[PDB]
Amino acid sequence: LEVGIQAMEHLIHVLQTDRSDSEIIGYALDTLYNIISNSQFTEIFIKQQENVTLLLSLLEEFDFHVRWPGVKLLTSLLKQLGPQVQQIILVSPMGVSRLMDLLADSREVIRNDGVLLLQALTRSNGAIQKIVAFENAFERLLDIISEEGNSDGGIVVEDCLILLQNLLKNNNSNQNFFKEGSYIQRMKPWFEVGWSAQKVTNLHLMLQLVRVLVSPTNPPGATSSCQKAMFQCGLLQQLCTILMATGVPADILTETINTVSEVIRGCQVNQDYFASVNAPSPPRPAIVVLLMSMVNERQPFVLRCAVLYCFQCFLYKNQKGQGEIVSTLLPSTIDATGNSVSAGQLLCGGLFSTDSLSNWCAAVALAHALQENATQKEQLLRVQLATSIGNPPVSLLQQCTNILSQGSKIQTRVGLLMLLCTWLSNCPIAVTHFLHNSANVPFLTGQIAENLGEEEQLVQGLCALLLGISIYFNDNSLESYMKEKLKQLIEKRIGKENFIEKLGFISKHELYSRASQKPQPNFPSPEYMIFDHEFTKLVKELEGVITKAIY
């Protein structure tokens, strides 16, 4: 029957008139919850709005047998028609304050279902999120988490973490209020290293909450000040202890690295601290343990991505650390014990490995050590590589260009071309060192000019970008390949219009867009590790001007 509505408008009638009899109120709310919970009936219950304001009134009743079904009914209304029921409540005076009192209930069957009610209340509603926080939610919910033994708690801490993230996710006002209120420091005891499926669950939501506060997506000063607070109160420090601790699930580990990544990104004090962390062995620097895993083929792909990202994060806006990395490739000392390995050595081993995952990673990692740093771009020009037991040395730059014409897989050459483009970009001297080897320009011209399917379109485009950078950042000091001669080479060998189209293959690649959204390595599987976030910005920055400059 459609008329399950008839015997409901009549339970509402009990709730209006019979309120001195709590046993009948309890029964009617319980029966109404039954009908609405399993919607059609929910839309009808709310259409008479003063029904919702009656429920609100009924929830001030301390009687267990009234307040409990009340809670569960209002949650059910909220889950089903969230925006509308949230509106009726916001527009009703003391509406949200009152619902907060349920979190103060001392019967814990009611405060627990209370938390689940507030989740449904705050979901996707900014203003309500703000009022909940004005009503002391942050302290109350942090208190209940402490009391329940933190990450060792049950579905109860899971539920307070979900609610805390409703309040903080996409809500700058409330992130600021959380910081301003000194609540960050209460996030630290969360992080003392057993391990049930629930503990894993709780701790994963805790790390996402740390990540929310320091997300690259935030106003920049909001992330800065949380990053500083997280240092000041020992929370970064505590996260790092999880990194080198024994017997922590692999997924907790991956996500603790991603978190630290964002807690240090672009913060000198935090990056200085991160690099200063050693593991137990001979002892290993944190940079070195990152780079070792990144280049290790037996480590899971998800983990390699997380250590790449920690490493970029370390280097981000960090010219001190960029130099520290690059100087490693210009060795100054002998270590008498054959023991220690350095950043430079691990990266050089990665560049020329047979694993293309390693090639790509090492090459992006290197580009990150060069970005917006002309000093280091120039230093990297001095790197010499050993060849055979009789032959002369080859430079790093030239060896990287050399792999492009080997039968190498595209993933290794996109990696290498992103390095080469970044390396020559805004560095007239590296352009000269590149254009000084006569094998190079004829190579790029040749790769760009020959019609080669659709798979090799990406590599062709990157070569165009490189050749184009050779022209744009050319200071005309090499008489063998000057600006105007290079343009006439394109015209004669390739055709300028044809050249600018191959250059366009980059921006148009199906994966380019996504790469360009956020800094974190997003790849679903190893085959998708193609573009690096920061490279997408250099394309966007240069594509236009390089086209303009070709005429």
Coordinates of C-alpha atoms in Angstrom, one line a residue:
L1 CA 0.0 0.0 0.0
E2 CA 1.0 3.6 -0.7
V3 CA -0.8 4.6 2.5
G4 CA 1.9 3.6 5.0
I5 CA 1.6 7.4 5.2
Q6 CA -1.8 7.2 6.9
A7 CA -0.6 5.4 10.0
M8 CA 2.3 7.9 10.5
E9 CA 0.6 11.3 10.4
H10 CA -1.1 9.7 13.4
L11 CA 2.2 8.9 15.3
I12 CA 3.1 12.5 14.7
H13 CA -0.2 13.4 16.5
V14 CA 0.9 11.4 19.6
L15 CA 4.2 13.3 19.6
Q16 CA 2.4 16.6 19.7
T17 CA -0.3 15.9 22.3
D18 CA 0.7 13.0 24.5
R19 CA 4.1 14.3 25.7
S20 CA 3.4 13.8 29.4
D21 CA 3.4 10.0 28.7
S22 CA 7.0 9.3 27.9
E23 CA 6.4 5.5 27.2
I24 CA 4.1 6.4 24.3
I25 CA 6.4 9.1 23.0
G26 CA 9.2 6.5 23.0
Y27 CA 7.1 4.0 21.2
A28 CA 6.0 6.5 18.5
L29 CA 9.5 7.8 17.8
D30 CA 10.7 4.2 17.7
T31 CA 7.9 3.2 15.4
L32 CA 8.5 6.3 13.2
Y33 CA 12.2 5.4 13.0
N34 CA 11.0 1.9 11.9
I35 CA 8.9 3.4 9.1
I36 CA 11.4 5.9 7.9
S37 CA 14.6 3.8 8.2
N38 CA 13.4 0.7 6.1
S39 CA 12.8 7.4 1.0
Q40 CA 9.2 8.3 0.2
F41 CA 8.1 8.7 3.8
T42 CA 10.9 11.0 4.8
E43 CA 10.0 13.7 2.2
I44 CA 6.5 13.7 3.7
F45 CA 7.6 13.8 7.3
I46 CA 9.7 16.9 6.7
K47 CA 7.2 18.7 4.4
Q48 CA 5.5 19.9 7.6
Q49 CA 8.6 21.6 9.0
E50 CA 7.3 22.1 12.5
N51 CA 7.6 18.3 12.8
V52 CA 11.5 18.6 12.7
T53 CA 11.3 21.4 15.3
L54 CA 9.2 19.1 17.5
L55 CA 11.8 16.4 17.2
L56 CA 14.4 18.9 18.2
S57 CA 12.2 19.8 21.3
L58 CA 11.8 16.1 22.1
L59 CA 15.6 15.7 22.1
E60 CA 15.8 17.9 25.2
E61 CA 14.1 15.1 27.1
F62 CA 16.6 13.3 29.2
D63 CA 14.4 10.1 29.3
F64 CA 16.6 7.4 27.6
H65 CA 13.6 5.8 25.9
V66 CA 12.7 9.2 24.3
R67 CA 16.1 10.7 23.4
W68 CA 17.6 7.5 21.9
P69 CA 14.9 6.8 19.2
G70 CA 14.8 10.6 18.7
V71 CA 18.6 10.6 17.9
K72 CA 18.2 7.7 15.5
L73 CA 15.2 9.2 13.8
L74 CA 16.8 12.5 13.2
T75 CA 20.0 10.9 11.9
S76 CA 17.8 8.9 9.5
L77 CA 16.1 12.1 8.2
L78 CA 19.5 13.7 7.9
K79 CA 21.1 10.8 6.0
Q80 CA 18.3 10.8 3.5
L81 CA 17.4 14.4 2.9
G82 CA 20.6 16.1 4.2
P83 CA 20.5 19.6 2.7
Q84 CA 16.8 20.2 3.5
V85 CA 16.8 18.8 7.0
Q86 CA 20.1 20.7 7.7
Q87 CA 18.4 23.9 6.5
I88 CA 15.3 23.5 8.7
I89 CA 17.7 23.0 11.7
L90 CA 20.1 25.9 10.9
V91 CA 17.1 28.3 10.5
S92 CA 15.7 27.0 13.9
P93 CA 17.2 29.0 16.8
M94 CA 19.6 27.2 19.2
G95 CA 19.1 24.3 16.8
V96 CA 22.7 23.1 16.4
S97 CA 23.7 24.1 20.0
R98 CA 21.0 21.9 21.4
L99 CA 22.0 18.9 19.2
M100 CA 25.6 19.4 20.6
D101 CA 24.4 18.7 24.2
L102 CA 23.9 15.0 23.0
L103 CA 27.7 14.8 22.9
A104 CA 27.6 15.7 26.6
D105 CA 25.3 12.9 27.4
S106 CA 26.8 10.6 30.1
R107 CA 24.9 7.4 28.8
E108 CA 27.4 6.4 26.1
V109 CA 24.9 4.7 23.9
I110 CA 23.4 8.2 23.3
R111 CA 26.7 10.1 22.9
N112 CA 28.0 7.5 20.4
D113 CA 24.8 7.7 18.3
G114 CA 25.1 11.5 19.0
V115 CA 28.4 11.6 17.1
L116 CA 26.8 9.7 14.2
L117 CA 24.0 12.3 14.2
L118 CA 26.4 15.2 14.0
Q119 CA 28.2 13.6 11.1
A120 CA 25.0 13.6 9.1
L121 CA 24.3 17.2 10.3
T122 CA 27.7 18.6 9.2
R123 CA 28.1 16.6 6.0
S124 CA 28.7 19.1 3.1
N125 CA 27.4 22.0 5.1
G126 CA 30.0 24.7 5.8
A127 CA 28.1 27.0 8.1
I128 CA 26.9 24.2 10.3
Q129 CA 30.5 22.9 10.5
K130 CA 31.6 26.3 11.8
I131 CA 28.8 26.4 14.4
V132 CA 29.7 22.9 15.7
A133 CA 33.2 24.2 16.2
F134 CA 31.9 27.4 18.0
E135 CA 30.1 24.9 20.3
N136 CA 33.4 23.4 21.5
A137 CA 33.3 20.3 19.2
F138 CA 37.1 20.2 18.8
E139 CA 37.9 19.9 22.5
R140 CA 35.0 17.5 23.1
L141 CA 35.9 15.1 20.3
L142 CA 39.6 15.2 21.1
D143 CA 38.7 14.4 24.8
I144 CA 36.6 11.3 23.8
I145 CA 39.5 10.1 21.6
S146 CA 42.0 10.4 24.5
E147 CA 39.5 8.6 26.8
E148 CA 38.9 5.7 24.4
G149 CA 42.7 5.1 24.2
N150 CA 43.2 7.0 21.0
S151 CA 44.0 4.8 17.9
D152 CA 43.4 1.8 20.1
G153 CA 39.8 2.8 20.6
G154 CA 36.8 1.2 18.8
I155 CA 34.4 2.3 16.1
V156 CA 33.9 5.2 18.6
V157 CA 37.2 6.9 17.7
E158 CA 36.7 6.1 14.1
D159 CA 33.4 8.0 14.3
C160 CA 34.9 11.1 16.1
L161 CA 37.7 11.2 13.4
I162 CA 35.1 11.2 10.6
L163 CA 33.3 14.0 12.3
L164 CA 36.6 16.0 12.9
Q165 CA 37.3 15.7 9.2
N166 CA 33.8 16.9 8.3
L167 CA 34.7 20.0 10.3
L168 CA 38.1 20.5 8.8
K169 CA 38.0 19.2 5.3
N170 CA 37.3 22.1 2.8
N171 CA 36.9 24.5 5.6
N172 CA 39.6 27.1 6.0
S173 CA 37.8 29.1 8.7
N174 CA 37.8 25.9 10.9
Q175 CA 41.3 24.9 10.1
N176 CA 42.4 28.3 11.3
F177 CA 40.3 28.0 14.4
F178 CA 41.7 24.6 15.1
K179 CA 45.3 25.9 14.9
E180 CA 44.5 29.1 16.7
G181 CA 43.0 27.0 19.5
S182 CA 46.2 24.9 20.1
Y183 CA 44.5 21.7 19.2
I184 CA 47.3 20.5 16.8
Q185 CA 49.4 19.5 19.8
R186 CA 46.7 17.1 20.9
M187 CA 47.2 15.3 17.6
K188 CA 50.7 14.1 18.8
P189 CA 49.9 11.4 21.2
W190 CA 47.9 9.9 18.4
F191 CA 51.3 8.8 17.0
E192 CA 52.9 6.4 19.6
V193 CA 53.5 3.0 17.9
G194 CA 49.3 -5.4 18.3
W195 CA 47.9 -3.6 15.2
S196 CA 44.2 -4.8 14.6
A197 CA 42.2 -3.8 11.5
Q198 CA 40.5 -1.1 13.7
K199 CA 43.8 0.4 14.9
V200 CA 45.0 0.6 11.2
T201 CA 41.6 2.3 10.4
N202 CA 41.8 4.8 13.2
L203 CA 45.5 5.7 12.5
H204 CA 44.8 6.2 8.8
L205 CA 42.1 8.8 9.6
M206 CA 44.5 10.5 12.0
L207 CA 47.1 10.9 9.2
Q208 CA 44.5 12.3 6.8
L209 CA 43.6 14.8 9.5
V210 CA 47.2 15.9 9.7
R211 CA 47.3 16.0 5.9
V212 CA 44.2 18.3 5.8
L213 CA 45.9 20.9 7.9
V214 CA 49.0 21.1 5.7
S215 CA 47.5 20.4 2.2
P216 CA 49.2 22.1 -0.8
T217 CA 45.7 23.2 -1.7
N218 CA 45.3 25.5 1.3
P219 CA 46.0 29.2 1.3
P220 CA 49.8 29.1 1.6
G221 CA 50.1 30.8 5.1
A222 CA 47.6 28.3 6.5
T223 CA 49.8 25.3 5.6
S224 CA 53.0 27.2 6.7
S225 CA 51.7 27.9 10.2
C226 CA 50.4 24.4 10.8
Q227 CA 53.7 23.1 9.6
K228 CA 55.5 25.3 12.2
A229 CA 53.1 24.3 14.9
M230 CA 53.6 20.6 14.1
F231 CA 57.4 21.2 14.5
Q232 CA 57.0 23.3 17.6
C233 CA 54.9 20.7 19.5
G234 CA 56.9 17.6 18.4
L235 CA 54.4 16.1 15.9
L236 CA 56.7 16.0 12.9
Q237 CA 59.3 14.5 15.2
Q238 CA 56.8 11.8 16.3
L239 CA 55.8 10.9 12.7
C240 CA 59.5 10.4 11.9
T241 CA 59.8 7.8 14.7
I242 CA 57.0 5.8 13.0
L243 CA 59.2 5.7 9.8
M244 CA 62.1 3.8 11.3
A245 CA 60.1 1.7 13.8
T246 CA 59.8 -2.1 13.5
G247 CA 56.6 -4.0 12.6
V248 CA 54.3 -1.3 11.3
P249 CA 51.9 -2.4 8.5
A250 CA 53.2 -1.5 5.0
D251 CA 50.2 0.7 4.3
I252 CA 50.5 2.7 7.6
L253 CA 54.1 3.2 6.5
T254 CA 53.4 4.4 3.0
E255 CA 50.9 6.9 4.3
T256 CA 53.1 8.1 7.1
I257 CA 55.7 9.0 4.4
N258 CA 53.1 10.9 2.4
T259 CA 52.1 12.8 5.5
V260 CA 55.6 13.8 6.5
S261 CA 56.1 14.8 2.8
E262 CA 53.4 17.4 3.2
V263 CA 54.4 18.4 6.7
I264 CA 57.9 19.4 5.4
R265 CA 57.1 20.6 1.9
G266 CA 58.4 24.1 1.5
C267 CA 59.2 24.6 5.2
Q268 CA 63.0 25.0 5.8
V269 CA 63.0 24.1 9.6
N270 CA 61.0 20.9 8.8
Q271 CA 63.1 19.9 5.8
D272 CA 66.3 20.7 7.9
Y273 CA 64.9 18.4 10.6
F274 CA 63.9 15.7 8.2
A275 CA 67.3 15.4 6.6
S276 CA 68.9 15.2 10.1
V277 CA 67.1 11.9 10.9
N278 CA 69.2 8.7 10.8
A279 CA 68.1 5.1 10.9
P280 CA 70.1 2.4 12.8
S281 CA 72.7 0.2 10.9
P282 CA 76.4 2.0 9.4
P283 CA 73.6 4.6 10.2
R284 CA 71.6 5.9 7.2
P285 CA 70.5 9.5 6.6
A286 CA 66.8 9.8 5.8
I287 CA 67.5 11.1 2.2
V288 CA 69.5 7.9 1.7
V289 CA 66.8 5.5 2.9
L290 CA 64.2 7.3 0.7
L291 CA 66.4 7.1 -2.4
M292 CA 67.3 3.4 -1.7
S293 CA 63.7 2.4 -1.7
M294 CA 62.9 4.5 -4.7
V295 CA 65.5 2.7 -6.7
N296 CA 64.7 -0.8 -5.3
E297 CA 62.7 -2.9 -7.8
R298 CA 61.4 -5.3 -5.2
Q299 CA 59.7 -2.5 -3.1
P300 CA 56.0 -2.0 -4.0
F301 CA 55.1 0.6 -6.6
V302 CA 52.9 2.5 -4.1
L303 CA 56.0 2.8 -1.7
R304 CA 58.4 4.0 -4.4
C305 CA 55.9 6.8 -5.2
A306 CA 55.7 7.8 -1.6
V307 CA 59.5 8.1 -1.2
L308 CA 59.8 10.0 -4.5
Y309 CA 57.2 12.5 -3.1
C310 CA 58.9 12.8 0.3
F311 CA 62.2 13.6 -1.6
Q312 CA 60.6 16.3 -3.9
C313 CA 58.9 17.6 -0.8
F314 CA 62.3 17.8 0.9
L315 CA 63.8 19.7 -2.0
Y316 CA 60.8 22.0 -2.5
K317 CA 61.9 25.7 -2.3
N318 CA 65.0 24.2 -0.5
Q319 CA 68.2 25.5 -2.2
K320 CA 70.3 24.3 0.7
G321 CA 69.1 20.7 0.1
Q322 CA 69.3 20.9 -3.6
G323 CA 73.0 21.8 -3.4
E324 CA 73.6 19.1 -0.7
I325 CA 72.2 16.6 -3.3
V326 CA 74.2 17.9 -6.3
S327 CA 77.5 18.2 -4.5
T328 CA 77.3 14.4 -3.8
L329 CA 77.7 14.0 -7.6
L330 CA 81.0 16.0 -7.4
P331 CA 82.8 13.9 -4.9
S332 CA 85.1 15.8 -2.5
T333 CA 86.3 13.0 -0.2
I334 CA 87.4 9.3 0.1
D335 CA 85.7 7.2 2.7
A336 CA 88.3 4.6 3.9
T337 CA 85.6 2.0 4.7
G338 CA 83.9 0.9 1.5
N339 CA 80.7 1.5 3.5
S340 CA 78.7 4.6 2.9
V341 CA 76.5 5.3 -0.1
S342 CA 75.4 8.8 -1.1
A343 CA 72.4 10.5 -2.9
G344 CA 74.4 11.2 -6.1
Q345 CA 75.6 7.6 -6.4
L346 CA 72.1 6.1 -5.9
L347 CA 70.6 8.5 -8.4
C348 CA 73.3 7.9 -11.0
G349 CA 72.7 4.2 -10.5
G350 CA 69.0 4.8 -11.1
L351 CA 69.4 6.9 -14.2
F352 CA 71.3 4.0 -15.9
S353 CA 69.6 1.0 -14.4
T354 CA 67.7 -1.4 -16.6
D355 CA 64.5 -0.7 -14.6
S356 CA 62.6 2.1 -16.3
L357 CA 60.7 2.9 -13.0
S358 CA 64.1 3.7 -11.5
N359 CA 65.1 5.7 -14.6
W360 CA 62.0 7.9 -14.5
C361 CA 62.2 8.4 -10.7
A362 CA 65.9 9.2 -10.6
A363 CA 65.5 11.6 -13.5
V364 CA 62.5 13.4 -11.9
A365 CA 64.3 13.3 -8.5
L366 CA 67.2 15.1 -10.2
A367 CA 65.1 17.7 -12.0
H368 CA 63.7 18.5 -8.5
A369 CA 67.3 19.1 -7.3
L370 CA 67.8 21.6 -10.2
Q371 CA 64.5 23.5 -10.3
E372 CA 64.8 27.3 -10.2
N373 CA 68.5 26.8 -9.2
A374 CA 70.9 28.1 -11.8
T375 CA 73.8 27.5 -9.5
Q376 CA 73.1 23.8 -9.2
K377 CA 72.3 23.5 -13.0
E378 CA 75.8 24.8 -13.6
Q379 CA 77.4 22.5 -11.0
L380 CA 75.6 19.5 -12.6
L381 CA 77.4 20.4 -15.9
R382 CA 80.7 19.4 -14.2
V383 CA 79.6 15.8 -13.5
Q384 CA 81.8 13.3 -15.4
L385 CA 80.9 9.6 -15.7
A386 CA 83.3 6.7 -16.1
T387 CA 83.0 4.7 -19.3
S388 CA 85.2 1.7 -20.3
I389 CA 88.5 0.5 -18.8
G390 CA 90.4 2.4 -21.6
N391 CA 88.0 5.2 -22.8
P392 CA 87.7 9.0 -22.0
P393 CA 84.9 10.1 -19.5
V394 CA 81.4 11.3 -20.7
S395 CA 79.5 14.0 -18.9
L396 CA 76.2 13.3 -17.2
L397 CA 74.3 15.7 -19.5
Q398 CA 75.6 14.0 -22.6
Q399 CA 75.1 10.5 -21.3
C400 CA 71.4 11.4 -20.6
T401 CA 71.1 12.6 -24.2
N402 CA 72.9 9.4 -25.3
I403 CA 70.2 7.1 -23.8
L404 CA 67.6 8.8 -26.0
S405 CA 69.0 7.3 -29.2
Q406 CA 69.5 3.9 -27.6
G407 CA 66.6 1.4 -28.0
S408 CA 65.3 2.6 -24.6
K409 CA 61.7 2.3 -23.5
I410 CA 59.6 5.5 -23.6
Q411 CA 59.1 5.7 -19.8
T412 CA 62.9 6.1 -19.5
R413 CA 63.1 8.8 -22.2
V414 CA 60.2 10.8 -21.0
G415 CA 61.9 10.8 -17.5
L416 CA 65.2 11.9 -19.2
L417 CA 63.7 14.5 -21.5
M418 CA 61.9 16.1 -18.5
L419 CA 65.3 16.3 -16.8
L420 CA 67.0 17.6 -20.0
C421 CA 64.2 20.3 -20.5
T422 CA 64.3 21.3 -16.8
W423 CA 68.1 21.4 -16.9
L424 CA 68.5 23.6 -19.9
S425 CA 65.5 25.8 -19.0
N426 CA 66.6 29.3 -17.9
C427 CA 70.2 28.3 -18.1
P428 CA 72.0 29.6 -21.2
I429 CA 75.3 27.8 -20.2
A430 CA 73.8 24.3 -20.2
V431 CA 72.3 25.1 -23.6
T432 CA 75.9 25.8 -24.8
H433 CA 77.2 22.5 -23.4
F434 CA 74.3 20.7 -25.1
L435 CA 74.7 22.4 -28.5
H436 CA 78.5 21.9 -28.4
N437 CA 78.1 18.2 -29.1
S438 CA 77.3 18.0 -32.8
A439 CA 75.4 14.7 -32.4
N440 CA 72.5 16.4 -30.5
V441 CA 70.7 18.9 -32.8
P442 CA 70.7 16.4 -35.7
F443 CA 69.2 13.9 -33.3
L444 CA 66.4 16.1 -32.1
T445 CA 65.6 17.3 -35.7
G446 CA 65.5 13.7 -36.8
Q447 CA 63.2 12.4 -34.0
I448 CA 60.8 15.4 -34.4
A449 CA 60.7 15.3 -38.2
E450 CA 59.8 11.6 -38.8
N451 CA 56.2 10.5 -38.7
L452 CA 56.1 7.8 -36.0
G453 CA 52.6 6.6 -35.1
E454 CA 50.9 7.8 -31.8
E455 CA 52.9 6.1 -29.1
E456 CA 56.1 7.9 -30.0
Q457 CA 54.2 11.2 -30.4
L458 CA 54.9 12.0 -26.7
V459 CA 58.7 11.6 -27.0
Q460 CA 58.7 13.6 -30.3
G461 CA 56.8 16.4 -28.5
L462 CA 59.4 16.5 -25.6
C463 CA 62.3 16.7 -28.2
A464 CA 60.5 19.7 -29.7
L465 CA 60.3 21.3 -26.3
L466 CA 64.1 20.6 -25.8
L467 CA 65.0 21.9 -29.2
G468 CA 62.7 24.9 -28.6
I469 CA 64.4 25.5 -25.2
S470 CA 67.8 25.4 -27.1
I471 CA 66.6 28.4 -29.1
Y472 CA 64.7 30.4 -26.5
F473 CA 67.4 30.3 -23.8
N474 CA 70.3 30.6 -26.4
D475 CA 72.6 33.5 -25.6
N476 CA 74.2 33.3 -29.1
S477 CA 77.8 32.7 -27.7
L478 CA 78.2 29.4 -29.6
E479 CA 78.8 30.4 -33.3
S480 CA 78.1 26.8 -34.5
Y481 CA 74.4 26.8 -33.4
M482 CA 73.0 30.3 -33.0
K483 CA 69.3 31.3 -32.6
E484 CA 68.5 32.2 -36.2
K485 CA 70.4 29.2 -37.6
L486 CA 68.4 26.9 -35.3
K487 CA 65.1 28.4 -36.5
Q488 CA 66.2 27.9 -40.2
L489 CA 67.1 24.3 -39.3
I490 CA 63.5 23.7 -38.1
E491 CA 62.1 25.4 -41.1
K492 CA 64.2 23.3 -43.6
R493 CA 64.3 20.0 -41.7
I494 CA 60.9 19.9 -40.2
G495 CA 58.6 22.9 -41.1
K496 CA 57.8 25.4 -38.4
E497 CA 54.0 24.8 -38.3
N498 CA 54.7 21.0 -38.2
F499 CA 57.2 21.7 -35.4
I500 CA 54.7 23.6 -33.2
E501 CA 52.2 20.8 -33.6
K502 CA 54.6 18.1 -32.2
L503 CA 55.3 20.4 -29.3
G504 CA 51.5 20.5 -28.7
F505 CA 51.4 16.6 -28.3
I506 CA 52.6 17.1 -24.7
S507 CA 49.7 19.3 -23.4
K508 CA 47.2 17.1 -25.3
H509 CA 48.4 13.7 -23.9
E510 CA 45.5 12.0 -22.2
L511 CA 47.5 12.0 -18.8
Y512 CA 48.8 15.6 -18.9
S513 CA 45.7 17.2 -17.2
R514 CA 45.5 15.0 -14.1
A515 CA 49.3 15.3 -13.6
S516 CA 48.8 19.0 -13.4
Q517 CA 46.2 19.1 -10.6
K518 CA 48.2 18.2 -7.4
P519 CA 51.9 17.6 -6.4
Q520 CA 51.4 14.0 -5.2
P521 CA 52.4 11.2 -7.6
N522 CA 48.9 10.0 -8.6
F523 CA 49.6 7.0 -10.9
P524 CA 47.2 4.0 -10.6
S525 CA 49.9 1.6 -11.8
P526 CA 53.5 1.7 -13.2
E527 CA 52.4 2.2 -16.8
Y528 CA 50.9 5.6 -15.8
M529 CA 54.1 7.0 -14.3
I530 CA 54.7 9.3 -17.2
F531 CA 54.3 13.0 -16.2
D532 CA 55.6 14.8 -13.1
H533 CA 53.5 17.6 -11.7
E534 CA 56.2 20.3 -11.7
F535 CA 57.1 19.5 -15.4
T536 CA 53.5 20.2 -16.4
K537 CA 54.0 23.7 -15.1
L538 CA 57.2 24.2 -17.2
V539 CA 55.4 23.1 -20.3
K540 CA 52.5 25.6 -19.5
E541 CA 55.1 28.2 -18.8
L542 CA 57.2 27.8 -22.0
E543 CA 55.0 26.4 -24.7
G544 CA 53.5 29.8 -25.6
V545 CA 56.7 31.8 -25.6
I546 CA 58.7 29.1 -27.6
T547 CA 56.0 29.3 -30.3
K548 CA 56.1 33.0 -30.4
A549 CA 59.9 32.9 -30.6
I550 CA 59.9 30.5 -33.5
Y551 CA 59.0 33.5 -35.8

